[PDB]
Enzyme design. Sequence first.
Site, PDB file in Angstrom:
ATOM      1  N   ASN A 194       0.771  -1.248   0.000  1.00 35.21           N
ATOM      2  CA  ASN A 194       0.000   0.000   0.000  1.00 35.21           C
ATOM      3  C   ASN A 194       0.807   1.307   0.000  1.00 35.21           C
ATOM      4  OD1 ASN A 194       0.788   0.078   2.781  1.00 35.21           O
ATOM      5  ND2 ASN A 194      -1.109  -0.973   3.371  1.00 35.21           N
ATOM      6  N   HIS A 196       3.726   2.262   0.596  1.00 36.22           N
ATOM      7  CA  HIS A 196       4.655   2.592   1.669  1.00 36.22           C
ATOM      8  C   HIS A 196       5.980   1.838   1.609  1.00 36.22           C
ATOM      9  CE1 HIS A 196       1.067   4.100   4.294  1.00 36.22           C
ATOM     10  NE2 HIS A 196       1.396   4.941   3.330  1.00 36.22           N
ATOM     11  N   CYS A 231       6.684   6.497   5.018  1.00 43.85           N
ATOM     12  CA  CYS A 231       7.273   7.155   3.856  1.00 43.85           C
ATOM     13  C   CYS A 231       6.729   6.597   2.546  1.00 43.85           C
ATOM     14  CB  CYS A 231       8.798   7.033   3.880  1.00 43.85           C
ATOM     15  SG  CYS A 231       9.609   8.140   5.057  1.00 43.85           S
TER      16      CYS A 231
END
Lengths: 276, 260
Positions: A194, A196, A231
């Site tokens: 997802n 990230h 992030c």
Amino acid sequence: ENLYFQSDDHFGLHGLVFRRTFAIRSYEVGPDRSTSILAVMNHMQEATLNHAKSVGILGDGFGTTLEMSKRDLMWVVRRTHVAVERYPTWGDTVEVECWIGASGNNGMRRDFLVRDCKTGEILTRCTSLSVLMNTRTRRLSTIPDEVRGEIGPAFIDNVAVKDDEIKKLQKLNDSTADYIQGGLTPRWNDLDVNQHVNNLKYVAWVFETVPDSIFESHHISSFTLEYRRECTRDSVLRSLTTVSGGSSEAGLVCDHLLQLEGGSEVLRARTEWRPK
Amino acid sequence: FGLHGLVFRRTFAIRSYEVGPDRSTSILAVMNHMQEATLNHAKSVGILGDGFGTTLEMSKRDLMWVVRRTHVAVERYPTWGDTVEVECWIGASGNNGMRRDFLVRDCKTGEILTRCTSLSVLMNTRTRRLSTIPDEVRGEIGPAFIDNVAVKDDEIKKLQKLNDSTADYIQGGLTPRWNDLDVNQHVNNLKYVAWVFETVPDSIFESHHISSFTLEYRRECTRDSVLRSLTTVSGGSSEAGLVCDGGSEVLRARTEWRPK
């Protein structure tokens, strides 16, 4: 003394502790023939995903149950503590013992024990704290009852790491950091399901600013990470490390910091080292 | 894992971190597997020596093996939850070379997923000169030789160096760390592969799978080496790899790609 800690055939119960053997592979060991802490953490991550399957917890995810998936919820690791007694070498056979448990009303902890199969000695002790996050709003969520109904019956109260051993971390002063490296950016394979960045990619970026002289001389005995922010693919990070020398009384210590460059904190971390 | 009789076999269960966002195993995980199968084979035929393939008779003559060419053919990448089985063995390659060949199968279907062969030669560590194979060393590894091939000579093409002045992608300042080094101060070969893919744009990894990978090594690097990676893309869909030190060639490489 916890019946559900034992394997299935011990008491005829559905056990809640996953077990799996790993033989140390060649590419997992450094030039000093010691398994890297990144290989150890890879082992525990792999055991994580296997565990969910073994206790009757639902379809992946990497996580992610139905009730979670309905509510656009995902697990995010917020704290990790690793205690290492001894690193195994090539050919050694280890066994990972892992399970999950409650952490307050809205946290879930995963704990790990890694033993040397020949000596029966404990090599690694670890616990990781995860919390629920909404993938849309990027906002922390409490644990809904439908999700507690899924993971709760898998809870056991045992710990591999006592609270005593885990200390709250102080952010290092980024203007006096001994080692700094910017322009750190994730590539396509570094991302998760997802949007990230992989959790162990963070660990790699931490070690970016640990000097080779410390890797040659010392082994990590303790590793503590506090995550504060996710992030993405367009993140550009700066790694920072500050060394607290060991030459009297005190042992070698490294403080760490990943920041978005600049300069919102992504994580803080602390390593303790012992002479090889 | 097991040897039978001179062909070593071993199963790998695909791990999560070995698999990409597309749920496909990376080519480096496959090459990680073969490095591992290499040493297992070596130990079981009793040629492991110092722990990495330098025998008793080799070290006395200051000789070590050096890989000079590698070709990897991938039909299909396994996915997470797949269990694969690796077959490895060695054989003579010309008068003074040794070849290591690999077959990787899916344990359920038995289909071959990957075929590979690597050519090694003896090199004097002191004089930096390639050496013939002394009878004392052939006496060590020779009885382990078999004639089978996983990859036909036909399939391996000699590589042309790309024009480094016309490279589509370039990245310098590549430097090895302590953990990137082997027992004798030299950088690990799988570190090179990482540096090769450094200048392959994410767009190709997203669109295509590697079907073929050919590497020709020329030179080793040390702890104080600083390297430049270069890639030139000539579809569809091929790229030519080049790794530069000054600008002396360290290796050249070639990947063939197919749409996912």
